[PDB]
Amino acid sequence: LNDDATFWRNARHHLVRYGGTFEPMIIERAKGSFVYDADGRAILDFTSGQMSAVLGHCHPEIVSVIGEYAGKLDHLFSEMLSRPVVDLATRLANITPPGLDRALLLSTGAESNEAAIRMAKLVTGKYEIVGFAQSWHGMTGAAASATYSAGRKGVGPAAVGSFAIPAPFTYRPRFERNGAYDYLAELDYAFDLIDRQSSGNLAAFIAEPILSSGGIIELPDGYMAALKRKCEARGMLLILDEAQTGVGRTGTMFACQRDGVTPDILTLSKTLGAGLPLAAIVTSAAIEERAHELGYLFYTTHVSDPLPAAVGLRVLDVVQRDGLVARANVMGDRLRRGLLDLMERFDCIGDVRGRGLLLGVEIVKDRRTKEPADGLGAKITRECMNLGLSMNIVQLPGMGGVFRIAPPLTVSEDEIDLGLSLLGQAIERAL
Amino acid sequence: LNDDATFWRNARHHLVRYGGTFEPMIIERAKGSFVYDADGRAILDFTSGQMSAVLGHCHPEIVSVIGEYAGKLDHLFSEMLSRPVVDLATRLANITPPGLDRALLLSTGAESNEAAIRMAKLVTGKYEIVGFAQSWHGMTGAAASATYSAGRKGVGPAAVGSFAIPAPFTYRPRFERNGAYDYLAELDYAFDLIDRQSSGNLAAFIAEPILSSGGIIELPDGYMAALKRKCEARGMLLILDEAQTGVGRTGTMFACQRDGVTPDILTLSKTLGAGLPLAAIVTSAAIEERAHELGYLFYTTHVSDPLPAAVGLRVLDVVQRDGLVARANVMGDRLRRGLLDLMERFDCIGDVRGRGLLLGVEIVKDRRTKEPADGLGAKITRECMNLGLSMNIVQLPGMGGVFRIAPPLTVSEDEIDLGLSLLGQAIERAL
Ligand SMILES: *Cc1c(COP(=O)(O)O)cnc(C)c1O
Ligand SMILES: *Cc1c(COP(=O)(O)O)cnc(C)c1O
Ligand code: NA
Ligand code: NA
Ligand code: NA
Ligand code: NA
Numbered sequence: 001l002n003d004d005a006t007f008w009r010n011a012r013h014h015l016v017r018y019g020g021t022f023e024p025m026i027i028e029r030a031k032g033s034f035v036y037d038a039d040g041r042a043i044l045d046f047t048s049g050q051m052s053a054v055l056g057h058c059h060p061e062i063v064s065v066i067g068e069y070a071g072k073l074d075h076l077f078s079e080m081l082s083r084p085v086v087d088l089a090t091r092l093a094n095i096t097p098p099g100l101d102r103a104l105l106l107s108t109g110a111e112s113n114e115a116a117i118r119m120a121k122l123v124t125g126k127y128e129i130v131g132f133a134q135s136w137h138g139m140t141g142a143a144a145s146a147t148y149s150a151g152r153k154g155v156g157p158a159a160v161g162s163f164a165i166p167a168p169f170t171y172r173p174r175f176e177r178n179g180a181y182d183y184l185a186e187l188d189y190a191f192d193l194i195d196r197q198s199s200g201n202l203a204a205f206i207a208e209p210i211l212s213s214g215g216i217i218e219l220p221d222g223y224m225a226a227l228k229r230k231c232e233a234r235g236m237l238l239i240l241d242e243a244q245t246g247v248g249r250t251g252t253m254f255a256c257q258r259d260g261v262t263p264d265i266l267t268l269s270k271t272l273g274a275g276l277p278l279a280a281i282v283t284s285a286a287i288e289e290r291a292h293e294l295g296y297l298f299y300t301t302h303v304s305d306p307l308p309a310a311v312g313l314r315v316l317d318v319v320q321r322d323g324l325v326a327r328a329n330v331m332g333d334r335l336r337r338g339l340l341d342l343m344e345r346f347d348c349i350g351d352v353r354g355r356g357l358l359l360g361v362e363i364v365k366d367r368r369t370k371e372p373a374d375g376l377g378a379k380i381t382r383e384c385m386n387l388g389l390s391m392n393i394v395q396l397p398g399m400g401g402v403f404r405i406a407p408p409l410t411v412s413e414d415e416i417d418l419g420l421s422l423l424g425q426a427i428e429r430a431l
Numbered sequence: 432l433n434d435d436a437t438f439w440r441n442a443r444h445h446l447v448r449y450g451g452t453f454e455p456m457i458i459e460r461a462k463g464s465f466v467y468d469a470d471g472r473a474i475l476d477f478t479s480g481q482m483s484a485v486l487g488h489c490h491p492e493i494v495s496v497i498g499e500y501a502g503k504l505d506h507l508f509s510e511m512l513s514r515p516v517v518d519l520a521t522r523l524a525n526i527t528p529p530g531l532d533r534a535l536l537l538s539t540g541a542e543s544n545e546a547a548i549r550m551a552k553l554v555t556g557k558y559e560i561v562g563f564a565q566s567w568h569g570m571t572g573a574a575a576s577a578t579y580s581a582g583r584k585g586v587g588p589a590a591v592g593s594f595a596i597p598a599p600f601t602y603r604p605r606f607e608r609n610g611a612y613d614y615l616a617e618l619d620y621a622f623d624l625i626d627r628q629s630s631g632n633l634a635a636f637i638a639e640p641i642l643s644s645g646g647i648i649e650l651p652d653g654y655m656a657a658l659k660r661k662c663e664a665r666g667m668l669l670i671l672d673e674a675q676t677g678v679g680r681t682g683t684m685f686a687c688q689r690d691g692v693t694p695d696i697l698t699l700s701k702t703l704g705a706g707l708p709l710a711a712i713v714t715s716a717a718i719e720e721r722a723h724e725l726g727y728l729f730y731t732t733h734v735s736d737p738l739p740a741a742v743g744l745r746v747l748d749v750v751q752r753d754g755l756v757a758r759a760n761v762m763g764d765r766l767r768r769g770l771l772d773l774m775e776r777f778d779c780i781g782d783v784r785g786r787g788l789l790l791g792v793e794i795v796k797d798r799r800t801k802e803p804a805d806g807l808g809a810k811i812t813r814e815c816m817n818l819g820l821s822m823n824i825v826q827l828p829g830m831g832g833v834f835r836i837a838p839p840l841t842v843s844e845d846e847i848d849l850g851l852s853l854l855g856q857a858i859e860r861a862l
Contacts, residue, residue: 007514014524018727021510027504028513029504030506070489078450080456080458081442082458083457085446087441089445089446090444093445101445104447108708110572114572121586122585126587127587141572141573143572144573156557160587160588203587243732270732276505277732285444390508
């Protein structure tokens with residue numbers, strides 16, 4: 001039973017609480033699309049852990065590779081190269097769009113964003129960073145100065161020179177031009193304000209192709225291109241954070257591929273490591289040469305370590321080999337349609353958005369008023385869990401609560417169906 | 432051969448350069464105290480990789496545990512607890528001094544410092560951070576604002592409210608009081624300046640017990656106690672970063688044990704993971720309760736993940752079980768004496784300092800003038816490598832270059848001797 005006295009005692013006495021509230025089960029094992037409690041109850045992992053386990057839990061290939069390396073090549077002094085590092089870097093250059101040639105291998109998303117922000121500052125000689133008011137780039141420093149979704153209050157001033165602009169949100173438009181939501185005009189409007197506050201040191205713009213923490217907000221068509229143009233005109237670099245969208249999740253290897261806009265710096269993390277701490281930045285040769293001439297330095301304990309790199313490589317091999325990006329379109333289509341059917345059934349589902357296997361469901365009081373549902377999301381979440389479906393909901397000011405759905409790319413037809421089933425029941429139970 | 436055309440081509444074309452310069456070998460395997468090149472040449476790893484592999488490379492126990500977990504429990508959604516997380520947290524509370532009760536499990540040193548700095552700010556409601564002018568706390572944000580050893584130039588303003596004070600350096604004293612280097616008077620002097628610049632928002636002081644990146648600088652006797660008192664009087668928390676000193680390296684489980692001063696927040700990283708990315712913060716129940724009441728939030732992709740925690744636990748078990756802290760005193764004594772004998776032989780060795788298995792050797796022009804050796808350290812380093820001894824030297828302004836010596840706690844008597852031997856030869860060859 002999950003109700004182990006010692007376990008719980010130890011947990012209340014020895015853990016720092018870092019947000020949220022601990023689920024009251026004891027996870028004992030994980031496999032594929034499920035996690036299992038101490039009672040052996042199977043729980044469908046509809047979020048791939050923290051949106052990272054693209055290949056599901058404990059995938060045999062990964063297990064196999066972690067094994068070969070753990071006993072052969074583990075961690076090395078930063079100046080020592082090895083084949084997995086070189087092969088992974090080479091691989092990354094080859095599958096990202098042209099113009100993305102050189103990679104830096106790290107451990108976390110925050111590190112990846114910091115490394116990128118630092119290169120941008122060095123190369124341009126400027127220091128102001130612009131991001132979205134609903135962004136999520138991590139908790140460490142700069143990455144945190146660039147994060148507006150949560151964590152700005154009570155901890156003192158943020159980094160000097162940070163600015164945010166509103167993200168385009170088609171579901172709850174707020175900028176009209178001749179009767180329609182004109183998101184490009186909104187962009188123009190936001191940049192003009194920026195231009196007025198800047199001290200003339202605009203270095204880069206950092207963005208997520210799909211705002212994950214911010215409520216599964218997809219940048220609309222032509223937006224990225226318009227953004228990139230805004231940057232070029234100002235001599236700023238464009239940094240794209242694909243921690244959540246990269247590695248096939250949205251139906252393309254990289255989300256940037258869909259739009260066709262290639263960023264100056266691309267950062268990867270959650271999905272690259274598939275559960276293990278591996279992260280990376282990918283940039284053009286020209287940018288790298290410059291940073292190098294300028295003395296760029298970025299040292300971490302685990303940069304270029306062989307084990308994590310061997311794992312990332314294996315992840316890419318599997319994804320390519322098994323046609324997992326394609327699978328993302330197919331299963332994503334199956335899931336989306338199912339969510340749309342739920343929306344047919346229940347008046348509380350206000351919107352179904354996202355792409356591929358990165359979907360969001362916005363819960364509302366009523367479909368016309370679009371009033372956010374107060375307390376219902378929480379109920380729903382509770383029932384899902386009870387029914388055996390692990391979900392995650394996020395609540396942002398001025399929005400209804402949003403369920404972030406993201407099953408493993410390896411998810412089966414049955415699992416998709418099972419999850420759709422448990423969800424409906426949960427909702428029915430929660431009204 | 433290490434001279435593989437494709438390898439090198441790929442490396443020059445696809446890797447971001449992040450400082451330093453790549454060693455020209457291809458590491459193919461690692462075991463115990465050695466790494467092996469493509470020619471199968473054994474290289475004695477006198478730095479435990481990047482000062483992390485406390486148990487040497489690929490230790491069978493670690494290999495064993497990585498194995499059990501990789502296939503059973505890997506990564507989980509942040510709100511789900513598991514036994515390795517709870518056991519590790521419990522273990523940490525039990526082996527750190529009284530007053531250190533609750534732990535947060537992360538991935539990197541920078542994250543650990545950020546988490547700690549953020550808790551300090553929240554809890555005190557203030558935001559100014561004080562550190563040492565020679566410190567190294569990581570590259571990510573706050574951790575970086577607190578880092579003065581390198582990386583401050585060219586990347587724009589640092590965090591608002593950062594101040595640094597000089598660290599006590601007995602080898603090159605600069606503060607005299609009645610004919611002697613009075614490091615406590617120096618401290619008083621530094622704080623008075625701080626007091627004058629502060630806006631009245633002093634939140635915490637962050638320090639390393641032994642400044643690693645800064646040149647293996649040991650805080651002298653009574654210093655820590657005096658520091659802690661300076662903090663208490665100002666309502667500031669004391670954060671101790673034991674990334675490099677923790678986990679038996681200096682001869683005690685934690686360096687803080689030697690002095691007997693227990694910090695308000697203790698951070699751990701390099702040594703805890705023994706090569707893998709695992710980090711942690713340990714604080715008192717009182718601090719944690721408060722932060723919690725205040726809404727403390729710290730989310731990372733890998734917080735509380737089962738695999739890394741299982742590894743950390745195994746590391747502690749081994750260390751405790753094999754009497755590795757004690758071993759640190761014994762081998763450290765053997766190494767130190769050997770370094771002292773080298774110092775007998777060569778006029779270029781100006782100082783041998785450090786503790787346990789964390790030692791530094793400062794290279795100088797001449798023993799009296801204490802003039803820093805220009806270019807010799809680099810030669811020496813080169814010859815070591817040629818002879819098969821992997822070393823790391825750091826050069827700081829106003830100091831001679833310093834070799835940072837840190838073999839695995841599992842290092843053998845023979846290995847210590849072999850390294851001492853190769854070192855002498857290297858030096859003899861480099862004059
Ligand atoms: C290396 C180090 C850190 C940061 O570790 P990373 O994993 O590189 O972020 C922090 N403090 C000290 C004293 C260190 O040596
Ligand atoms: C999670 C996340 C990051 C940071 O990852 P961490 O490992 O938690 O530091 C950065 N960007 C995005 C878009 C993320 O979702
Ligand atoms: Na490394
Ligand atoms: Na490319
Ligand atoms: Na986790
Ligand atoms: Na304790």
